[PDB]
Every structure is written in C-alpha cells, then in structure tokens.
Amino acid sequence: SDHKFLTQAVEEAYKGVDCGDGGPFGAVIVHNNEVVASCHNMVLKYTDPTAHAEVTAIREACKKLNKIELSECEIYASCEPCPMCFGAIHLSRLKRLVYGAKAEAAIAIGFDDFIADALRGTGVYQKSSLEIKKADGNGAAIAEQVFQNTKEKFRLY
Template sequence: MPSAEFMRRAIAKAREGIAAGQTPFGACIVRDGRVAAAEHNAVWDATDPTAHAEVRAIRAACRALGTVDLSGCVIYSTCEPCPMCFSAIHWAKISTIVFGARITDAQALGFSELPIPNQTMKREGGSPVELVPDFLRDECLALFREFAAKSDRRVY
C-alpha cells in the first residue's frame, strides 16, 4: 500500500527545487518504511541533463545503503519517470514505482519528454517493477501549476 507520507516527502523536495530555480520533480526512495534518500531535480544547478530527481535519489540511496541493489525499495516520484529514469530504476532493481503526475503532464508544461508510458516500458522490456500510477495526482499537478505560474521558470 503506497504511503501518502512518502509521496508528500517527494512533493516537498520538488517544492524545494522549484524555490531554488529548478523544476517540479521530486523523488523519495524508501526501504523498510524508512527514507533512504529524497532529492529534487537539479538539471540547471548541476548543468547536467541527467540530474533528474529519480537518478539523484538512486545515487544517494545507493551511497546511503552501501549497495547498487535497491531490491525491496519503493520510489515515490511526483511525475511518471522518463525513459532514462525508468531504466535506472530497473537497473537498480527497485521493486515499485509510485508516481503522481503523468509524463504527458510534464510534456504539456513544455518539457522535451519522450512520452513513453512506464506501463509500455515495463511490458516491452519485461521489467518486474510494480507500478502504482496517479497516486496523490492532484497534489502533484498542483506542483506543476505552481511551476507554470513562475515567470522565471525554465524547461529543458
């Protein structure tokens, strides 16, 4: 059963990112009911197009847990992971992805997304990851509206 507490942790990280001039994406990785890592997108700050919230959270969780095998972990993401992030989640062996907004919602904000749904990647790639879509979707879409209202917002 997904946890509103952990999704709201991802949402809070995304808000931190928005306040820091980043984007409305946050991720939280949980193992055994405890947060292993929580990060926001930092593409602009890091000058790195791969510095997505999910990838940053995976890197931080691997460091914190001392392993590249995140089996048994759940990742909460404010948005459906892009193909790069889905692949990283698969390679890290994260068991479950819980996401709020859809990748098409990010595309509608102007982000240059490859709008391939996670369900399609799971099916076509044979990934064992469990998907829990649309969790706290309205709260995640509220982040997108906050971001869209900023006059200095930047998309990539």
Template sequence: MSSEQQQTSSSKLTVTKVDECFMAAACMSANAGVILRHGGPFGASVVRDGMPISCAHNTVLYSKDPTCHAEVNAIRHAVRHLGRSELSDCVLYTTCEPCPMCWGAIMASGLKVMYVGADRYCAARFGFDDKAFYDEFAGPESGTMMPVNPTKTEEDEKWMAK
C-alpha cells in the same frame, strides 16, 4: 478496505496514508528545488522498511548535468547511503512518471515498486515533454533510432571474454 486506503486505477497497489506522506516528501523536495532554481519541478524519495533512505529533486540547472533528474539523484543518494547498488527491497515515490533515462536507472537499481504522481502527458502540458525520448527508445521499427555505426574489433571481444 479502510478509509485510510484507496485502490489505484492503474495497478493493484494500495495507497496508504504512509505512502501519501512519502509522496508528500518527494513533492516538498520538488518545490524546494524550484524555489532554489535547481531544475524542473520534480522530486523523488526512496524508502526501505518504512524509513526514508533518500529524498531528492531535479538539479539539472544547478549541476549543469542533464542526468541529474530527481529519480536518478534519489537513487544515487540511496545506494551511497546503503553501500550497495541494488535497491530491490526499497520503494520509489516520484512526483511524475519517469522519463526513459530514469526508467533505465530504476530498472538497473532493481527497484520493484514505484508510486507515481503525474503522468508524462501532464508533464508535457506544463512544458516538460519527453515524447521525443519515448519515441527514440520505442525501437528500430519506429524509424527514429539514432544510427549506430558498428566498430567491433578483436579488442572488443577480448575484454568481453575476461
């Protein structure tokens, strides 16, 4: 392995100097977002074939939209730029482990490779604790799932059959 590469402990991905640059871009976007008071200190970038497609930060406060996390914003920009909803040939760089909502967006977009800076426990130490969300989505056996009242009707089945 060259001096420009290091093996990550949590996966078999090799982190190169280029990867570090794309992560630095995500970090710079996160810092800009904090300075601009757009939201929490989180940034993300989407890269395809070594070219940055999008770079975004958390804009929850600025947009007054709780879904405007860095990863979601970066995915939204990337799919608009590429003109498609599928990003399986792209790589995501994010400054922190994604929350459950962002994980859903990442999975729905088809992203297969992701580099993560801090983990959820580090974020929690700085006041960004998503444990309640992770617990909520752990499954019914956790006893925390929001109750769902079934309202299935014939109309529900009609649109699914189309």
C-alpha cells in the same frame, strides 16, 4: 504510507524549483518505511542533464546503503519517470515505483514529449515486471497541480 511519501516527493519538487536546483520533480526512496534518500531535479545546479530527481535519489540511496541494488527499497516520484529514469529504476533493482502525476502534466507546460514505453507497456524489446502504482485521488491531484503551480518559477530544459 503511500500518501506520505508521495507528498514528500511533491514537496521536494516545490523546494527544488524554489531554490533553483532544477525543474519541479521530486523523488523519495524508502526502505521499509525509512527514508533513504529525498531529492529533487538537480540539472541546473549540477550542470548535468542526467541529474533528474529519480536518478539523483538513486545515486544518493546507493551511496548511503553501500550497495548498487535497491531491491529492498521503493521509489516515490512526483511525476511519471522519463525513459532514462525508468531505465535507472530498472537497473537499480528497486522493487516498487509509485508516481503521482502523469507525464502529460509535465508535457503541458513545455517539457519534452518523452515517455517511457516500458512503464506504459508499449515496447517490443524493453519489458518490465516492476510493480508500478499510479496514484489516484488526493495525492494524485496535488501532484498533477505542481506544473501549473511552478511554471513561472523556472526555465525549461
């Protein structure tokens, strides 16, 4: 099931840059194999620097399910969530995070050197016990190639 939803997130990233909504980032939120939300970065469309793919997906899922906690749900991120998005995933009580590409793949095409300490377990104050899976092989390679594929199609932010 992981490959399918990670692929959906990657396709959301491509779709979002293609229609100009934002950068090449997708996020899918799933409730026991049922897709709750499927979104991409909307920073450009919304004029909202917090409208990353993960935050947008969390907002949509929470509005659809009429609750502020997503503890029965899991999130699939095309790219490793940034500090803001990882904080949002923590606050939303999502129980599992699967992400495709490492943050360095996005940094390689000019994005901020902006990595979540709690995700990589490098913090003093912020800890995390959230189940985190970094994808490997198939979908991981496809997810990593997103930034080289789309870097000519959008403006950095």
